[PDB]
Structures are given as C-alpha cells and as structure tokens.
Paper text:
The full-length [name] ([name]-FL, 949 amino acids) exists as a tetramer in solution, but the individually prepared N-terminal domain ([name]-NTD corresponding to the sequence 1–496, also containing a [name] tag) and C-terminal domain ([name]-CTD, the sequence 519–949) form a monomer and a dimer, respectively. [name]-NTD has a single α/β domain and a β-helix-containing domain, whereas [name]-CTD folds into two α/β domains and the linker comprises three α-helices.
To determine the [name]-NTD structure, we successfully crystallized the fusion protein of [name]-[name]-NTD as well as its Se–Met derivative and used single-wavelength anomalous diffraction method for phasing. The native structure was refined to a resolution of 2.35 Å. One [name]-[name]-NTD monomer constitutes the asymmetric unit of this crystal. Except for the sulfonate part, it had few interactions with the protein, suggesting a possibility of nonspecific binding.
Residue numbers in the entry: -78 to 97, 104 to 290, 305 to 492
C-alpha cells in the first residue's frame, strides 16, 4: 500500500510514489539528485519539524498528496568576512563593544577630508581590507579567496540622532534569538544569499537604511557580473527610489536604471517596461570589482574619487544604458525579485518606531529596552521608544518620544509630545544633552524658519531663551554642524539644562549651565562619543532588568 508525496522547494512541487514503510532516505536522495545538490545540503521539513532520513511515512502519520518542504542549509562552514564602513569613532572600538573577532570582521571609515560615495566607499573598504589581510598575495589573488559581505553604515544619520554615533545598525531592537540589534537581525539574509551565490561572486554590497525581509526561499542566482535584488513596484512607489527598468518581453535582463523617476516619466514607459525597486543588495564578480575600483580612482593618479555606485556605475548598466561607460557596459547583469520580499526603512526617528512595530507584528507601538521606567505607561503614550535610559517618577511624557542614553535621575522633567531626549557620554565623566524633535531633519541654515530644533524654529528656540547668534561659536549654514548641545559633568546640571532646553526656558540656572558649558554639534557628538560608557550603562540596565524579584 503506497502513498504519493509532494516535495516543494518553494517554486515547484514534485511527486514521489513510496511505500508507507520505506525510509524517506530514497526520496530525499532522489530529490537532491534532481536539484544537482546532494542530500547533506538540504533540510526536509514536514508539518514544521525537521525529519531524519531513516523515518518511514507510517511513522509520522502522513497521507496521500502531502507536501514536504525542502529548504537549503548553509548554517555552518566557511564563514564570510564582514567589511563595515562605520563612523571613525566607532571603528576604534567596534570589536570590543560587540565582542567579535577581527578575522570575521573588518571595519574602516572614509578618510578624513573628502567623501567617496557608495562606489568609492566600497573601493576604499576593499582596499583597506586587502591591506590588512593580503598576507603577501596580490589584490586579484586576495579577492578570489573568500566571500565577503560589505555594509555601508558610515553616514551622518542626520534624521536618527538617537543612534547616529553607533552607526544605526548597532541599535537594539525588541521582541514580543537572544539579545539582538539591526545588524544581527539583517545579516542572516546576506549570509544565506552569499552562500547560495556562485563561487565567482565574492563581494556582496549592502547600503541604504532599509531592513530587508522575506519568509519564502530564494531563487537560484544567475552567473552574471552584477546581480541586484529588487521588488516589483508600481510607479506610485517606484518614483521614490532607484528603479531597474526591464523590457516587457525580457523580465530578467536589465534594460536600464533610473534614480527616482517622475510619475509622468513612468507613465510614459508603463506600456513598454516593468519596474523593480532597488533594495540595496548587490553582488559583484571579480571583473566587476576591478572595473568599479578603477572607476573609483582618478585618470593619472590612482588614489581616490567620489564615485556613485548607483548613479555613476549603476546608470551605465543594461542593454540601453543612459550614461556611457566602455568597460562598465560590458558587465552582464541579473535582476532578481525577492520572493516574499518585504522592506522597512529606518533612516528616520518616526521610521525607527513604525518599522520596529511592523517587523515585530510579523513574528502596540511602545518599546522599552535596557531601561528603568518609574512612571506608568498606557495607550495614550503611543509611539514610544525608551532605551538605555532611566525615567524617574517625576517625569511627564505624552506620545511620540525617543528617549535614549538617559542616566539614573530623579528629574522633574516634562517632555512635550514629539520631543525626544538623547544623552551621550563624553569624556571620562561628562554627558552631552541632545534634546531634539521627532521630525527634525537636522539640515538647514539657522536663520530659516523651516530649520527646527525640537520641532520649533531654531531662531524662535534661541529667542525664547534670550540667546542670540552671538552665543554660537562657528558656522550657521547647517544645523547638523551647529554646536548647540552642552556637555555637563553632573546628572543634576544635566536635568537642569535639559529642562531649560525643553519646556522651562525661564529656568535661569539652566541657561547659566548652558553658557558655561562646552557646546557640541551632532557631528562632534558622533565624532567624540564615549561609546564604552554608553554600552556600560546599557549593560547595567540589562543586569538590573534580570533581577527577577525586583519591582
């Protein structure tokens, strides 16, 4: 008495006739043989549990026309090196802070001076890695050796001040795994991809501020020189991103690239092309890497040049490139839709909150991590993110807040809706107070009424406190470089000055403190932050949160 069984890899289903008392070893071996691989490289699941190979259908009570799911399995084995472009202050400390070893993890920062872009940055990352792990080989020989995952996270993070000095990707994210952050949440996708990739694509490039997800298995990975992942997009969303346009009859090859097309330009091609949103996951062959790298160097001298991977290099790809490049155009290109692909941005504060809510609600918009909260919390306090902070019982809060870094205190601090509070350790014992607003973009000349601090015009913020531009040493063209935030040496002064910078501008001692305190811009904060004290405080809050009998 026999039974028919489907096995699905994610795309197709294939039927096996087998006797109910025959071990599945034969079936799994045959399915592995069919898909070129071998049974060791596959994971067969039925009902959700991983099954052995010496088990018979009668053992696990399966019936005719049932389906078993065959996922790939590249968990252990040859591990890829991670190359990070990070803020320079975090480079010195990343390995100690996250306790990873330098064999698996290399990082650097853009050199002090001019910026290099996505392409130039990638070239500098590959170069700085080779210069430390070459072991005598040449560059082309070194690149062949390992698969490597490169992450761009070295920008200024103007719109996410709470985690700019730690590069955004080191942000703790809750759950409702062990302890985890954005990077640890995202990296398994990159690792799975890079395992499934051919052994000629040795460099994955990830950039942007978008967390990518998918609950379905990946498709096979072509053997082009450039592979790019994307999501099928209607123009209503294509217009906001980089777009791969492909011919109607050729949904695999890349026709050309677009950087944020207009709604009309897309309607002008709606009959002749399909559109994929670039999600910032690329794979390059060694030849692609060499060509990108030489395009990231000058003509005569071979050193450094701003080169944009997506607007310079990228726009030169496809069968109908828009910008000319002799060598770049010769590279083949594959555009892969991400099966079950999902994307959630985290470049801005509002996005941190809403994206973590959306991601959590897949495997209520209030999030408390590594914190002591001494006030009650109800559904009126919606859109909340408290992390590495002590919220004393005399605080008054509302909704839409990001509170990060706040040391232990009994402050009577009121926090208006939409206002956020960040504290950043500085020096051996100081604290920089960085209040701001949920929609501050931290860009703009100070004399423009659209340039805001804590959601009100900067000039107004200055005049409510009796301050003039005479009290600001330095530039005023760009709020991100304006030294407004004071460094103080006590939690008392810290609370006094924070109150003064929010709802109590009449607090005289607050203004006195600010006037006698060193002033930091956001750039100087993320350039000088004492990350070790920030992590130490976070861990002390964790340890306190593990005291089971404490209320």
């Amino acid at each position: 008495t026999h039974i028919n069984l489907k096995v699905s890899d994610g795309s197709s289903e294939i039927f096996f006739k087998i006797k109910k008392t025959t071990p599945l070893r034969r079936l799994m071996e045959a399915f592995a043989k069919r898909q070129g691989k071998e049974m060791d490289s596959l994971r067969f699941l039925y009902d959700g549990i991983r099954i052995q190979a010496d088990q018979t259908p009668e053992d696990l009570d399966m019936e005719d026309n049932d389906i078993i799911e065959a996922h790939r399995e590249q968990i252990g084995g040859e591990f890829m090196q991670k190359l990070l472009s990070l803020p320079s202050n975090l480079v010195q400390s990343f390995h100690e802070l996250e306790r990873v070893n330098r064999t698996d993890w290399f990082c650097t920062s853009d050199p002090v001076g001019k910026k290099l872009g996505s392409g130039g940055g990638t070239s500098w990352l590959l170069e700085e890695c080779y210069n430390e792990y070459s072991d005598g080989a040449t560059f082309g020989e070194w690149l062949e050796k390992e698969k490597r995952i490169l992450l761009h996270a070295g920008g200024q993070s103007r719109r996410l001040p709470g985690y700019a000095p730690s590069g955004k990707i080191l942000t703790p994210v809750p759950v409702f795994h062990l302890g985890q952050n954005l990077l640890s949440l995202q990296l398994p996708l990159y690792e799975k991809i890079m395992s499934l990739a051919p052994d000629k694509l040795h460099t994955l490039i990830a950039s942007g501020d978008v967390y990518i997800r998918s609950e379905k298995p990946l498709q096979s990975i072509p053997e082009a020189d450039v592979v790019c992942y994307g999501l099928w997009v209607d123009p209503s969303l294509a217009t906001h991103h980089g777009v791969f346009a492909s011919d109607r009859k050729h949904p695999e090859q890349l026709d050309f690239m677009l950087q944020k097309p207009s709604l009309a330009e897309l309607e002008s091609l709606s009959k002749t092309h399909l559109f994929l949103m670039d999600i910032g996951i690329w794979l390059l062959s060694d030849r692609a890497v060499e060509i990108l790298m030489k395009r990231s160097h000058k003509e005569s001298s071979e050193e450094l040049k701003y080169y944009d991977l997506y607007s310079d290099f990228g726009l030169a790809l496809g069968t109908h490139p828009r910008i000319e490049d002799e060598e770049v155009n010769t590279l083949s290109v594959a555009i892969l839709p991400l099966p079950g692909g999902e994307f959630y941005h985290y470049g801005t504060s509002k996005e941190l909150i809403s994206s973590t809510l959306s991601v959590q609600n897949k495997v209520p918009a209030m999030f408390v991590q590594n914190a002591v909260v001494r006030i009650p919390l109800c559904a009126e306090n919606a859109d909340l993110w408290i992390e590495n902070s002590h919220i004393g019982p005399k605080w008054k809060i509302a909704s839409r807040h990001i509170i990060t870094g706040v040391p232990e205190n009994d402050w009577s601090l009121a926090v208006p809706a939409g206002v956020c509070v960040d504290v950043v350790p500085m020096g051996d014992k100081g604290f920089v107070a960085r209040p701001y607003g949920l929609d501050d973009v931290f860009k703009g000349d100070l004399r423009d009424s659209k340039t805001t601090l804590t959601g009100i015009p900067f000039g107004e913020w200055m005049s409510k406190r009796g301050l003039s531009y005479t009290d600001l040493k330095g530039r005023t063209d760009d709020l991100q470089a304006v030294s407004v935030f004071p460094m103080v040496n006590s939690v008392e002064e810290l609370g006094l000055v924070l109150r003064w910078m929010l709802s109590e501008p009449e607090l005289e001692e607050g203004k006195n403190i600010w006037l006698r305190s060193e002033h930091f811009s956001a750039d100087e904060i993320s350039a000088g932050a004492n990350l070790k004290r920030l992590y130490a405080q976070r861990e002390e809050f964790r340890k306190g949160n593990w005291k089971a009998l404490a209320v």
